[PDB]
Enzyme design. Structure first.
Site, short mmCIF file in Angstrom:
data_model
loop_
_atom_site.label_atom_id
_atom_site.label_comp_id
_atom_site.label_asym_id
_atom_site.label_seq_id
_atom_site.Cartn_x
_atom_site.Cartn_y
_atom_site.Cartn_z
N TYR A 26 0.74 -1.26 0.00
CA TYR A 26 0.00 0.00 0.00
C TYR A 26 0.77 1.31 0.00
O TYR A 26 0.22 2.34 -0.40
CB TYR A 26 -1.00 0.01 1.16
CG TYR A 26 -2.18 -0.89 0.91
CD1 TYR A 26 -2.10 -2.27 1.15
CD2 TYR A 26 -3.36 -0.39 0.36
CE1 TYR A 26 -3.16 -3.11 0.84
CE2 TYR A 26 -4.42 -1.22 0.05
CZ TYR A 26 -4.31 -2.58 0.29
OH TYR A 26 -5.36 -3.41 -0.03
N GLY A 28 2.75 3.91 -1.55
CA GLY A 28 3.07 4.23 -2.93
C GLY A 28 1.78 4.27 -3.71
O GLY A 28 0.72 4.01 -3.16
N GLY A 30 -1.55 3.67 -5.64
CA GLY A 30 -2.50 2.58 -5.52
C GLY A 30 -2.32 1.69 -4.30
O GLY A 30 -1.78 2.11 -3.28
N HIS A 46 -4.08 5.28 5.52
CA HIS A 46 -3.90 6.59 4.90
C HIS A 46 -4.68 6.70 3.58
O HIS A 46 -5.31 7.72 3.31
CB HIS A 46 -2.41 6.86 4.65
CG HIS A 46 -2.11 8.24 4.15
ND1 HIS A 46 -1.65 8.49 2.87
CD2 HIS A 46 -2.22 9.45 4.74
CE1 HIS A 46 -1.47 9.79 2.70
NE2 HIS A 46 -1.81 10.40 3.83
N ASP A 47 -4.65 5.64 2.78
CA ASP A 47 -5.36 5.63 1.50
C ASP A 47 -6.87 5.70 1.70
O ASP A 47 -7.56 6.44 1.01
CB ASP A 47 -5.02 4.38 0.70
CG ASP A 47 -3.54 4.20 0.50
OD1 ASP A 47 -2.78 5.15 0.80
OD2 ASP A 47 -3.14 3.11 0.04
N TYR A 50 -7.84 9.20 2.50
CA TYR A 50 -7.94 10.12 1.36
C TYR A 50 -9.19 9.85 0.57
O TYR A 50 -9.83 10.77 0.07
CB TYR A 50 -6.71 9.98 0.46
CG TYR A 50 -5.55 10.84 0.90
CD1 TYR A 50 -5.35 11.13 2.25
CD2 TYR A 50 -4.65 11.36 -0.03
CE1 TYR A 50 -4.30 11.92 2.66
CE2 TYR A 50 -3.59 12.16 0.37
CZ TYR A 50 -3.43 12.44 1.72
OH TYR A 50 -2.40 13.23 2.14
N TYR A 66 -3.69 22.83 4.29
CA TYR A 66 -4.21 23.01 5.63
C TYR A 66 -3.19 23.72 6.50
O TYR A 66 -2.15 24.18 6.02
CB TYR A 66 -4.57 21.66 6.26
CG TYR A 66 -3.54 20.56 6.07
CD1 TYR A 66 -3.75 19.55 5.13
CD2 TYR A 66 -2.37 20.53 6.82
CE1 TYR A 66 -2.82 18.54 4.95
CE2 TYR A 66 -1.42 19.53 6.65
CZ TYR A 66 -1.66 18.53 5.71
OH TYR A 66 -0.74 17.53 5.51
N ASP A 92 -3.00 12.87 7.25
CA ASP A 92 -1.55 12.97 7.14
C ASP A 92 -0.80 12.85 8.46
O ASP A 92 0.20 12.13 8.55
CB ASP A 92 -1.16 14.27 6.45
CG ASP A 92 -1.46 14.24 4.97
OD1 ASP A 92 -1.77 13.14 4.46
OD2 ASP A 92 -1.38 15.31 4.33
NA NA Z 1 -1.25 4.20 -1.52
#
Ligand code: NA
Length: 117
Positions: A26, A28, A30, A46-47, A50, A66, A92
């Site tokens: 995960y 990087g 995609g 994290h993905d 987002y 932000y 983040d």
């Molecule tokens: Na990713």
């Protein structure tokens, strides 16, 4: 803001953003399969964060800037009124702190192996 995210990384930890450009399934561009380790889980979350960030009106994780402060190794998200910035900063900050606390198995670097379904 992608730029802020990488700066938010070296604040909390020692490893720069390049160390993560390609790790596990995960970290990087995609992501697929199931995270291989603690760090890869950091990226997994994290993905999804987002992906969630995009469900906020006028909220783009790459460009949205932000407010936050870094008193190394301490990160603080100052935004409260702006939901996108608030939520986005949280994503983040969580990842940056996660990355620094998790281990780095250089073995799980660039692997796709059967592991990343
Ligand atoms: Na990713």
């Amino acid at each position: 803001n992608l730029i802020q995210f990488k700066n938010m990384i070296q604040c909390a930890g020692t490893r720069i953003w390049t160390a993560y450009v390609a790790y596990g399934c995960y970290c990087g561009k995609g992501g697929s399969g199931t995270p291989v380790d603690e760090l890869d889980r950091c990226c997994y979350t994290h993905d999804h964060c987002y992906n969630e960030a995009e469900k906020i009106p006028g909220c783009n994780p790459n460009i949205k800037t932000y407010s936050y402060t870094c008193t190394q190794p301490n990160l603080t998200c100052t935004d409260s009124a702006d939901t996108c910035a608030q939520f986005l900063c949280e994503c983040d900050r969580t990842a940056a702190i996660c990355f620094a606390s998790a281990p780095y198995n250089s073995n799980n670097i660039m692997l796709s192996s059967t592991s990343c379904q």
